[PDB]
């Protein structure tokens, strides 16, 4: 459908004149960031952003592509080069090292320079690289990690952990030789490496000994504690800190976030990853936006400021399943969390970056009409006289042959939350993609986010803006009020 | 392969410190642009840029992803929203209207507001929108159109034409009713609508009457003149301008570009589109870079400045064939042309923008090792135990079944210049994609290119920077020396 207002060139000329006016008003801050926030859309590449924009636009009864996402409103954009040192198409662990520690790493390691080697515990020591979050804590800021995945998953683990193997969630995962060599599982590192004021997301099971019933699924043994070392890491964490609280559901999270006596908060809301937003039990589980707000309630108390990591962690997972419906609905909630954080913080003193760790082989094609559903069929048949979808994957589990041929697809089928878009190459999981991802920035020193940069730039600009090591001589004035 | 220097965190910290230093040195100009250049990579989306970067990096005996393209060096980046008014995934005609005229249009029209309708001649008048190039000419600047496609193709036609049908290359293409209604073919518009100082690219055949042997292929009738109205548009164009020259080969182009008496130059080097760079006869045909330099030789003579359109027009065509080798080699030549123009002009007085009209359903995935060929196989087999490539398409003519199954692929096969990467959906031509594309900018007012913008912003910022209508009250100082 052609929106009538857009048929008039004045519509476009007025918009562009407004855009030019806004562009001219942008001025660099001479002042430091008090607070730092990184919003990480796991797998949220450029095709994901545009597709999610269209879906969100239509969610609010618009045509789609013309309505800005909250992230679209950020004044400064750069492209981020995501390659790992050893692989062109990266993973979440080693990208986390880049955007959180400022150093590129090898595929599937976390918080380590590329002198380390995947799954080789004895290459760990000397190669630890300290995150901006760690440095923020050292400078007396409060720090928070918020994600829809396990809090021990690769991305949040980049804020605190150093490991040659992202798969080492608990001691149960670590081979005997590595345990002997002192490579700690990620759950242990979470509570041991540094003080973290707010930890919210999934990953209950890795904190408790085998045999410990999950409080939410006490009748499902597979959801229970995983630990073989008898440790209760939650009790250990609580024992270290006066004013610490542990919660596992939304109601207790709410109570904790408003409780003045709570100085440290760990909320682990599922045994593993949190449910997709479309599957979330809104009585039992907080959304990413709600967790973001809860984190901000506590972190904002510190007069020295805070560093906050917020991850739309299951965007990635949706794409891996080649279920664009899941990827894009996760992306919208991620954008909602960005929007919410923007309402609760000031760009006068808070540097916010939105980025992705890497992309996916997700494409948005065919020649669909303005206003058509992103989950719809491309107009016109394929060469095999069957329909095809506007959303497709290069590879992944949506590749199908029924009776020796590519299957036809209907609108009702293509629009289902369980539908897997077709791909060229069958894989159990669709792959990451290696093309550049966007970095969006707002706040003090955000104007430094520009051009095409190595992904490591994200960590460095954040440390610089807050005058953290190695940029204590930042020569910036104190944060603005 | 893991490059040893990158194993040291100091490598990444030094690079980022340098990047921060460079970012801090950026300052906005208070002065206007004397010259304007738009480099348009047709179909050159973010996945194309990254893949081309890797290929070019390796061309210069590097590992790939770490080596900047010339476009990567531009300080200012924005994302450009490419939707047409009527379709989410756009074509070249209506995107051309956006980035060259500053107004969005309907799919397959050129230089017209979205009040016009495709292939409806009687909806043309009143809906013409004037290009920045036209306005530059009106302001006394010299103007040039350079492309590897037909000069009557959708993208260059956006600089000068207004038509409800991009397919109307010559009068032979225009239906009787539209001819009667005065909708002129694009070849006629090229010579009639405005004075253009330099016109270089393909499209000889549309300028000459049926029966006219092509000078380069005098024995191939299909390459001969197409016109049914008896007009020789080249003679007509020459007759209008003292100091005008027409050339059809590289040798004459060279002579013309150095000839002080040549004020107007039309070089039409193939009957239709120019050959792919990998097929170019370097005695008979200039490369895009060579055409760019030839245009700059003449355009730079005008003390008032110039507007130059330079198109990597066959990037798009490579992707349509699902032959990434062609798409990416075209992209590298496009980047070479950008680099060359940067050597021949000053960023003190020249605003250069590099962008794409839209993207393609091209993806770069699997988990290939650092330094591996972009045309290689992904490590590890697909679920069907056969190999697959790191480059894939969502749809297009690379979809194959041999004996009822997806074919295996070898490195020798995947690396061939004729190889079509596999897709999910068979189509005679792979489709454009609708995700945002990059805009790179350098020069006076380039800092205004920021954030996420409608594609129309590209035209507007260019007009503004040069103080052209509608921005004659730009309030900028005269261009810098
Ligand atoms: C990490 O430990 C591994 C495993 O013991 C070491 O690999 C051995 O190295 C020796 C000498 O090069 C070889 O002869 C063995 O075959 C290797 N063993 C295995 C099982 O791979 C490795 O040298 C250690 N690395 C460091 C940095 O100490
Ligand atoms: C959220 O978690 C809290 C804390 O564990 C749960 O509160 C317990 O509820 C059980 C069953 O009603 C009671 O026996 C205990 O008195 C409560 N413990 C505490 C420390 O308050 C609460 O049930 C959970 N909410 C939901 C919906 O499951
Ligand atoms: C452009 O010309 C077309 C073709 O003549 C016009 O379409 C006709 O419109 C009348 C009245 O609405 C219909 O009854 C006919 O069936 C149409 N003819 C065809 C062949 O489509 C159209 O109205 C014209 N548009 C303008 C702006 O004048
Ligand atoms: C490039 O074009 C020029 C101009 O048309 C060609 O020059 C002509 O060559 C023919 C054949 O040798 C001569 O009969 C004419 O004297 C030339 N015409 C002019 C006006 O110079 C030239 O041959 C072309 N080059 C190539 C390699 O084909
Ligand atoms: O970390 N990752 O995304 C991975 C891990 C293993 C693998 O085979 C491919 C990708
Ligand atoms: O022994 N276990 O792992 C158990 C025991 C009881 C229960 O409700 C859940 C798990
Ligand atoms: O815990 N929190 O801060 C919350 C919880 C729920 C909600 O809707 C908003 C904020
Ligand atoms: O202009 N285009 O890119 C087109 C034209 C026709 C079509 O069916 C699809 C795409
Ligand atoms: O009549 N024709 O179209 C012709 C005639 C002669 C020739 O060499 C080429 C084309
Ligand atoms: O015509 N030109 O300006 C040229 C032609 C060829 C070349 O290699 C460089 C410039
Ligand atoms: Ca739960
Ligand atoms: Ca030729
Ligand atoms: Na393992
Ligand atoms: Na036609
Ligand atoms: Zn990831
Ligand atoms: Zn993640
Ligand atoms: Zn992933
Ligand atoms: Zn195009
Ligand atoms: Zn084009
Ligand atoms: Zn195209």
Curated annotation (Swiss-Prot), chains A, B:
Q: Which residues bind Ca(2+) per the record?
A: 216, 269-270, 285
GO molecular function terms noted in the UniProt entry:
alkaline phosphatase activity; magnesium ion binding; zinc ion binding
Q: What is its EC number?
A: 3.1.3.1
Tissue-level expression reads: Detected in placenta (at protein level).
| SUPFAM superfamilies attached to this UniProt entry | Alkaline phosphatase-like (SSF53649)
Q: Which cysteines are joined by disulfide bonds?
A: 121-183, 467-474
Record protein name field = Alkaline phosphatase, placental type
Species per Swiss-Prot/TrEMBL record: Homo sapiens
User: Which residues make up the binding site for Mg(2+)?
Assistant: 42, 155, 311
Quaternary organization: Homodimer.
Question: Cofactor stoichiometry and binding?
Answer: Binds 1 Mg(2+) ion. Binds 2 Zn(2+) ions.
Q: Which Gene3D superfamilies match?
A: Alkaline Phosphatase, subunit A
Listed binding positions for Zn(2+) 2 are 316, 320, 432
List the SMART domains: alkPPc
């Amino acid at each position: 459908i052609i929106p009538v207002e857009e048929e008039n060139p004045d519509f476009w000329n007025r918009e562009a004149a407004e855009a030019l006016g806004a562009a001219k008003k942008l001025q660099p801050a001479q002042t430091a960031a008090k607070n730092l926030i990184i919003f990480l859309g796991d797998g949220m590449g450029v095709s994901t952003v545009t597709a999610a924009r269209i879906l969100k636009g239509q969610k609010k009864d618009k045509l789609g592509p013309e309505i800005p996402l909250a992230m679209d409103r950020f004044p400064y954009v750069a492209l981020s080069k995501t390659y790992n040192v050893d692989k062109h198409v990266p993973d979440s662990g080693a990208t986390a090292t880049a955007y959180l520690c400022g150093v590129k790493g090898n595929f599937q390691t976390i918080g380590l320079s590329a002198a380390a080697r995947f799954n080789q515990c004895n290459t760990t020591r000397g190669n630890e690289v300290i995150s901006v979050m760690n440095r923020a804590k050292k400078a007396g800021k409060s720090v928070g990690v918020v994600t829809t995945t396990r809090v021990q998953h690769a991305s949040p683990a980049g804020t605190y952990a150093h490991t040659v193997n992202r798969n080492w969630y608990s001691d149960a995962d670590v081979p005997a030789s590595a345990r002997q060599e002192g490579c700690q599982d990620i759950a242990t590192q979470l509570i041991s490496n540094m003080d973290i004021d707010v930890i919210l997301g999934g990953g209950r099971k890795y904190m408790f000994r085998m045999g410990t019933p999950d409080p939410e699924y006490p009748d499902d043994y597979s959801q229970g504690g995983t630990r073989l070392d008898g440790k209760n890491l939650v009790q250990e964490w609580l024992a270290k800190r006066q004013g610490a609280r542990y919660v596992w559901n939304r109601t207790e999270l709410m109570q904790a976030s408003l409780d003045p006596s709570v100085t440290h908060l760990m909320g682990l809301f599922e045994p593993g990853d949190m449910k997709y937003e479309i599957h979330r039990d809104s009585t039992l589980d907080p959304s990413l936006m709600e967790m973001t707000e809860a984190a901000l309630r506590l972190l904002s108390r510190n007069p020295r400021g805070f560093f906050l990591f917020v991850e739309g962690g299951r965007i990635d997972h949706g794409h891996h399943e080649s279920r664009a419906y899941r990827a894009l609905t996760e992306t919208i909630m991620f954008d909602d969390a960005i929007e919410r954080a923007g309402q609760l913080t000031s760009e006068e003193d808070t540097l916010s970056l939105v980025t992705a760790d890497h992309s996916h082989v997700f494409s948005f094609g065919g020649y669909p009409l303005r206003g058509s559903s992103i989950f719809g069929l491309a107009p016109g048949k394929a060469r095999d006289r069957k329909a095809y979808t506007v959303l497709l994957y290069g590879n992944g589990p949506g590749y199908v042959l029924k009776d020796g041929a590519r299957p036809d697809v209907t609108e009702s089928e293509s629009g289902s939350p369980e539908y897997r878009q077709q791909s060229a190459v069958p894989l159990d999981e669709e792959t990451h993609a290696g093309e550049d991802v966007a970095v969006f920035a707002r706040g003090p020193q955000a104007h430094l986010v520009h051009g095409v940069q190595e992904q490591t730039f994200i960590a460095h600009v954040m440390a610089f803006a807050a005058c953290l090591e190695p940029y204590t001589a930042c020569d910036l004035a104190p944060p603005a009020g």
